[PDB]
């Protein structure tokens, strides 16, 4: 919302969140969506291991650098690996 | 083409700190002896000529720096718009200023 | 008696620095034209080179507290791989601008590209030189307009004295129709108080 | 192909690892090791005028490396003088 | 010119979030 | 103290290279600096065709660049590193007249 832009200068996607949710390299989690099999996978993998849910799916597209400025794109993710 | 971000940041930082990139006209295989980067390599690894050449071309085409060519050496120089843009990518604040302003 | 491969370093060390310079002349000509750069030099210091220049408008070359000169200072360092800071350029000034060919040719080139035609510029230049104490000038403009020459007074064009008294310069102008080759030559027979041969005097 | 090779009896014929004797001229490019496999694998000197990128008619005497044609233009500044 | 398929949630080699795995012959990420 | 130091002067122009030694020997008036050995001239030579395209009567430019050099190894350790700096400062500043000091 404010300093997050500092961080981006984190990941988005199933293939890259799993690859950082496990092995305990992650940080914080923020769920979303369309299908349970993508809602109760991570959540159950959150059951083992931080686990949180942000109110909206779009602001992730906003907070993250998925825009160019105008065309925000939704994208659920839950891995703040960098967290520098 | 798949240029690493570390190279981008290294070049930006080197430019702002020196305000000047003195580059050689080349287009074959070979690394640059100057700017440097580290990606879990254990030892800072220098960039490749193709990568930096493409980056410089994009930057100049965007109007960030100007250049002279002399013979066999692209000399570059960043404009005011340059200082106003790198500081953003390095994630800097307007207070900071290039080194050369500090009695070379 | 002596070994010929030791002094070879000293001989080869002096030759490299000569070329190290000409590149400087080219670069300045491509860059600091705004200040009408004339010539440069070099002086290998303990840890750097004390390059000094001559430009008619000293102010243009340097910036706020010489800021842009400082900018240039670092640049050269990386190109030659010398330590910054140690670099110490110097800036000079030319007094009799109507006695140097290069500043006049550059001003004339700019003027020509100001849409003004050859005649006015050439006559302005020759007037400027003659009013600056010169025996004579000669302006030649060649391109898509042949050769239209203009001359005022006496010049020498043959002999050893030419290389020291006569000073020539040349340029190229990229105009829409083609290229306008322009050159200039000035003959000052009083340079540095040197006596031109076959110039005699007798007294009472 | 990283898990393959030839017969051992043939390996005895491998070229001597002794470094190749055909280098590339550098007047002053860090020596470091898909199309990358053979972009310019062929190795050969590329001595050329340090003014004009031309590989033809270059003097190597005294370590000049200047094209003969481009020599006349800059000879005056380089110091060479035309007498005798 | 090999092609690609829309990604699916198959990496779940379990029956209740049991993380079973972290295919013809063997292979590891990258070449080694 | 004493270092068996050496003085070497290298340059192209006979005028300055001969005038500069006179000032040096002035400065070494009392430190015993003496005559310099004058090495044979290293007359570098280059020849080239005058025509970029090789037309007409074959003609040839002949440029050459000489490298005069003189040596004042006389000081040796006769002088101290303290005034070896003094040796290097009172001397005139000629734009190009390379010099180097070794023991
Ligand atoms: Zn050439």
- Residue F15 C-beta-side C-alpha neighbours within 13 Å: 1
Q: How far apart are CA B25 and CA B74, in angstroms?
A: 6
Number of domains composing chain B: 1
Q: Which residues contact B89 (CB under 8 A, 6 or more apart)?
A: A9, B8, B9, B12
C68 within a domain of the structure (yes/no): yes
d(Cα B15, Cα B36) in Å, to the nearest integer? 12
Name the β-bridge partners of C37.
C55
Angle of helix C118-130 relative to helix C101-112, nearest 10 degrees? 150
C22 inside 8 A of chain F by CB? no
Q: What is the DSSP string of chain E?
A: --------S----SSSS-------S---STT-
Question: Which chains contact A through at least 3 pairs of Cβ atoms less than 8 Å apart?
Answer: B, E
Identity of the residue in F12, F95, F100 whose CB atom sits nearest the CB atom of C41: F95
Distance B70 CA to ligand 1 centre (A): 13
SS3 labels along chain B: CCCCHHHHHHHHHHHHHHCEEEECCCCCCCECCCCCECCCCCCCECCEHHHHHHHHHHHHHCCCEEEECCCCCEEEEECHHHHHHHHHHCCCCCCCCCHHHCCC
What is the distance between the alpha carbons of residues B1 and B55, in angstroms, rounded to a whole number? Answer: 10
We report the CATH number of the domain holding residue C28 as: 3.30.300.20
Distance CA B49, CA B57 (A): 12
Instruction: Point out the domain boundary residue: C67, C93, C119.
Output: C93
| CB distance B19 to B99 below 8 Å | yes
User: Is C123 within the bounds of a domain?
Assistant: yes
Distances (CA, A) of A62 to A4, A75, C3, F61, F72: 11, 9, 75, 72, 76
- Number of structural domains chain C divides into: 2
| CA-to-CA dists, residue D53 to D26, E6, E31, angstroms | 13, 50, 41
Closest CA to C183 of C143, C141, C144: C141
| Helices B5-18/B49-61 angle, 10° precision | 60
User: Cβ of A45 and E16 within 8 Å?
Assistant: no
Which residue has 């190229």 as its token pair?
C172
Minimal Cα–Cα distance from C22 to chain D, Å? Answer: 6
Contact call for E22 and A22, based on CB within 8 A: yes
* Same domain (yes/no): C32, C58: yes
Whether C4 maps to a domain, the answer reads: no
CA distances from A6 to A11, A63, A82, B88, B89 (A): 14, 11, 11, 10, 10
Contact A12, A75 (CB under 8 A): yes
**CB count in 10 Å sphere of residue C126:** 23
* Sign, CA torsion C145/C146/C148/C149: positive
B25 touches chain D (CB under 8 A): yes
Rounded to a whole number, what is the largest CA-CA distance in chain A? 39
Question: How many contacts, defined by CB atoms under 8 Å, are there between D and F?
Answer: 28
Beta-bridge mates of residue F99: F9
PDB resolution in Å: 3.2
This structure was determined by cryo-EM
Three-class SS state of F87: helix
Q: What are phi and psi of F84, to 5 degrees?
A: -60, -40
User: Alpha-carbon distance C32 to C56, whole Å?
Assistant: 11
- B99 occurs within a structural domain: no
Q: Which two tokens stand for residue D73?
A: 């233009």
The closest alpha carbon to C15, from D79, F102, F99, F41, belongs to D79
Q: What is the side-by-side strand order in the sheet with C52-55?
A: C37-39, C52-55, C90-92
Structural domain boundaries, residue B19: 1-93
| F 43-72 → C contacts, CB under 8 A | 67, 69
Are the C-beta atoms of residues B23 and B60 closer than 8 Å to each other?
no
Task: Spell out which residues of chain B touch residue C31, defining contact as CB-CB under 8 Å.
Answer: 68, 75
- Helix, coil or strand: residue F90: coil
How close F56 gets to chain C, by Cα (Å)?
24
Nearest chain B residue to A6 by CA distance is B91
Interchain CB distance below 8 Å, F98 and C17: yes
The Cα of A2 is separated from the nearest Cα of chain E by a number of Å equal to 33
What is the torsion angle, in degrees rounded to the nearest 10, for the CA atoms of residue B65, residue B70, residue B71 and residue B76? -20
Q: CA-to-CA distance for F11 and C48, rounded, in angstroms?
A: 19
**Mutant choice from E17, E18, E20 vs A, greatest count of A C-beta within 10 A:** E17
Chain C residues with CB inside 8 Å of F85's CB?
none
**C80 Cα: distance to centroid of ligand 1 (angstroms):** 21
> Which residues, by Cβ under 5 Å, contact ligand 1, an ion?
D 49, 51-52, 67, 70
D57 alpha carbon to ligand 1 midpoint, in Å? 9
Report residue A22 CA to chain centroid gap: 14
Contacts of B101 (CB under 8 A, 6+ apart): C67, C70
C-beta separation of C53 from C37 below 8 A = yes
d(CA C180, CA C185): 17
**Do strands C52-55 and C90-92 pair parallel, antiparallel, or not at all (unpaired)?**
parallel
Taking residue C59's Cβ as centre, other Cβ atoms within 10 Å add up to 10
Contact flag F100-C14 (C-beta cutoff 8 Å): no
Residue in chain D closest to C80 (alpha carbons) equals D28
3-state helix, strand, coil in chain D (%, to 5): 25, 10, 65
Whether residue C125 contacts residue C184, with contact meaning beta carbons closer than 8 Å, is answered with yes
| Chain D interface includes B26 (CB < 8 A) | yes
Distance CA(B48)–CA(A13), nearest Å, equals 30
**Order of strands, sheet of F68-71, starting from the edge strand that comes earlier in the sequence:** F37-38, F68-71, F6-11, F99-102
Give the pairing type, strands B74-78 and C52-55: unpaired
3-state DSSP of chain C = CCCCCCHHHHHHHHHHHHHHHHHHHHHHHHHCCCCCEEECCCCECCCCECCEEEECCHHHHCCHHHHHHHHHHHHHHHHHCCCCCCCCCEEECCCCHHHCHHHHHHHHHHHHCCCCCHHHHHHHHHHHHHCCCCCEEEEEEEECCCEEEEECCCCCCCCCHHHHHEEEEEECCEECCEEEEEEEEEECCCHHHCCCCCCCCCCC
Chain C hits for D62, Cβ within 8 Å: 12, 15
CA distance F16 to B94: 52
Q: How far apart are CA C72 and CA C75, in angstroms?
A: 5
From CA C146, how far away is CA C118, in angstroms rounded? 13
Decide if C19 contacts F96 (C-beta within 8 A): no
Q: Give the three-class secondary structure for F102.
A: strand
Asked if D50's CB is within 8 angstroms of B31's CB, the reply is: no
The answer to whether C181 and C118 have CB atoms below 8 angstroms apart is no
By the 8 A CB rule, do B48 and B75 touch? no
Write the residue in F49, F52, F65 that is nearest to D80 by C-beta.
F65
Q: How many whole angstroms from D49 Cα to the centroid of ligand 1? A: 5
Contact (CB, 8 A) for F83 and F1: no
**Which chains does chain F touch, 3 or more C-beta pairs < 8 A?**
C, D
CA distance C85 to B104: 5
Helix (H), strand (E), coil (C) string for F28-85: CCCCCCCCCEECCCCCEEEEEECCCCCCCCCCEEEEEECCEEEECCCCECCCCHHHHH
Residue with tokens 């640059």: B32
**Which residues are registered as beta bridge partners of B23?**
B74
Cα torsion F17, F23, F25, F27: sign: negative
Determine contact, residues C2/F39, Cβ cutoff 8 Å: no
The token pair at E5 is: 């398929």
Q: Which residues of C touch B99 (CB under 8 A)?
A: 74
Instruction: Evaluate whether C122 touches C112 at the Cβ level (below 8 Å).
Output: no
Extract the tokens encoding A26. Answer: 């992650």
The residue with tokens 């076959």 is C198
Residue B38 lies in a domain: yes
Which secondary structure element, helix H or strand E, spans residue A18, and what is its range? helix A14-21
Task: Say what the alpha-carbon torsion angle C96, C102, C103, C108 is, to the nearest 10 degrees.
Answer: 120
Residue in chain F nearest D61 by alpha carbon: F46
Tell how far the Cα of D69 is from the centroid of ligand 1, in angstroms. Answer: 6
> Is beta strand C178-187 parallel, antiparallel or unpaired with respect to C136-143?
antiparallel
Contact residues on chain F for D62, CB-CB shorter than 8 A: 44
Q: Are residues C171 and C114 in the same domain?
A: yes
Instruction: Calculate the alpha carbon distances from C202 to A16, B24, C197, F65 in Å.
Output: 99, 63, 15, 40
Whether the CB-CB separation of C150 and C138 falls below 8 Å is answered with yes
For residue D1, give every residue at least 6 positions away whose Cβ sits within 8 Å of its Cβ, in sequence order, or none.
none
Domain co-membership, C18 together with C65: yes
Q: C197 lies in a domain?
A: no
According to DSSP, the residues that pair with F102 across neighbouring strands are F6
Number of neighbours of residue C51 by Cβ within 10 angstroms: 21
Tokens found for residue B104: 């070379």
F44 CB neighbours in chain D (<8 A) are: 62, 80
CA distance F32 to F29: 6
Domain boundary among C93, C109, C132: C93
Do the beta carbons of residue F60 and residue F47 sit within 8 Å? Answer: yes
Determine phi and psi for C91, rounding to 5 degrees.
-120, 135
Range of the domain at C110: 101-187
- Spatial distance between the Cα atoms of B16 and B97, rounded to a whole number of angstroms: 8
DSSP character at residue F24: H
Task: Report yes or no on chains B and D touching (3+ CB pairs under 8 A).
Answer: yes
Residue C153: which CATH number? 3.30.1140.32
Q: Exposure string (b/e) for C127-156, b if CB count within 10 Å is 16 or more?
A: ebbbebebbbbbbbbebeeeeeebebeebe
Q: Which of E7, E12, E22 sits opposite A41 (nearest CB)?
A: E12
Neighbours of chain D (3+ CB pairs under 8 A): B, C, F
Residue with tokens 């006559």: C123
Query: How far is the C-alpha of D48 from the C-alpha of C15, rounded, in Å?
Result: 19
Which residues are CB-neighbours of A20 under 8 A, at least 6 positions away? A11, A26, A79, A81
Task: Specify which residues C175 forms β-bridges with.
Answer: C178
DSSP-assigned letter for residue F5: B
Chain B residues with CB under 8 Å of a chain C CB are 18-22, 34, 68-71, 73, 75, 77, 98-101, 103-104
Is D63 touching C (CB cutoff 8 A)?
Answer: yes
């Amino acid at each position: 919302k404010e300093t997050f832009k500092r961080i981006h200068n984190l990941v988005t996607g199933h293939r890259q969140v799993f690859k950082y949710l496990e092995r305990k390299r992650a940080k914080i989690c923020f769920l979303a969506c369309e299908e349970k099999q993508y809602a109760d996978i991570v959540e159950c993998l959150c059951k083992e291991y931080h686990l949180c849910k942000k109110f909206t799916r779009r602001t992730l597209g906003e907070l993250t650098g998925q825009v160019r400025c105008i065309k925000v794109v939704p994208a659920s993710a839950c891995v703040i690996h960098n967290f520098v | 083409v798949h240029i690493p971000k570390a190279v981008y940041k290294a070049v930006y930082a080197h430019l702002y700190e020196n305000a000047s990139l003195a580059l050689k006209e080349y287009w074959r295989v070979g690394n640059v002896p100057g700017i440097t980067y580290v990606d879990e390599n254990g030892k800072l690894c220098n960039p490749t000529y193709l990568h930096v050449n493409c980056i410089m071309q994009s930057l100049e085409s965007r109007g960030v720096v100007k250049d002279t060519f002399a013979w066999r050496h692209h000399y570059y120089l960043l404009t005011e718009k340059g200082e106003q843009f790198i500081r953003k990518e390095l994630d800097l604040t307007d207070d900071v200023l290039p080194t050369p302003y500090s009695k070379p | 008696i002596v070994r010929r491969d030791e002094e070879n370093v000293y001989y080869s060390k002096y030759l490299n620095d000569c070329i190290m310079e000409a590149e400087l002349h080219e670069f300045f000509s491509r860059e600091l034209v705004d200040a009408g750069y004339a010539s440069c030099s070099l002086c290998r210091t303990i840890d750097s080179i004390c390059v000094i220049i001559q430009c008619a408008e000293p102010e243009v070359v340097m910036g706020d507290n010489h800021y842009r000169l400082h900018k240039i200072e670092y640049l050269l360092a990386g190109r030659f791989m010398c330590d910054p800071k140690n670099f110490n350029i110097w800036v000079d000034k030319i007094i009799k601008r109507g006695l140097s060919a290069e500043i006049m040719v550059d001003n004339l080139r700019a003027k020509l590209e100001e849409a003004m035609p050859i005649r006015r510029a050439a006559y302005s230049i020759i007037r400027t030189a003659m009013r600056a104490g010169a025996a004579g000038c000669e302006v030649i403009v060649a391109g898509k307009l042949r050769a239209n020459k203009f001359k005022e007074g006496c010049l020498i064009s043959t002999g050893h004295p030419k290389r020291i008294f006569l000073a020539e310069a040349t340029r190229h102008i990229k105009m829409r129709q083609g290229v306008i080759g322009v050159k200039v030559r000035i003959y000052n027979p009083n340079i540095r108080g040197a006596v031109m041969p076959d110039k005699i005097e007798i007294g009472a | 192909r990283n898990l393959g090779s030839c017969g051992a009896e043939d390996l005895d014929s491998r070229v001597h690892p002794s470094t190749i004797f055909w280098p590339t001229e550098a007047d002053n490019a860090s020596g470091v090791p898909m199309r990358e496999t053979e972009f310019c694998t062929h190795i050969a000197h590329k001595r050329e005028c340090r003014i004009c990128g031309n590989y033809n008619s270059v003097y190597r005497k005294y370590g000049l490396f200047i094209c003969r044609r481009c020599f006349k233009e800059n000879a005056g500044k380089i110091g060479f003088v035309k007498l005798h | 010119e090999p092609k690609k398929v829309r990604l699916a949630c198959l990496k779940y080699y379990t029956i209740k979030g049991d993380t079973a795995e972290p295919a013809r012959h063997a292979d590891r990420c990258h070449c080694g | 103290m004493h270092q068996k130091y050496t003085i070497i002067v290298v340059g192209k122009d006979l005028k300055l290279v001969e005038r500069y030694v006179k000032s040096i020997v002035k400065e070494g008036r009392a430190f015993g600096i003496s005559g310099p050995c004058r090495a044979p001239v290293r007359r570098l030579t280059i020849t080239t065709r005058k025509s970029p395209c090789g037309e007409g009567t074959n003609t040839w430019h002949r440029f050459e660049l000489r490298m005069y050099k003189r040596t004042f190894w006389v000081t040796c350790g006769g002088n101290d590193i303290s005034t070896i700096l003094s040796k290097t400062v009172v001397i005139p500043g000629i734009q190009v007249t390379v010099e180097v000091e070794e023991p």
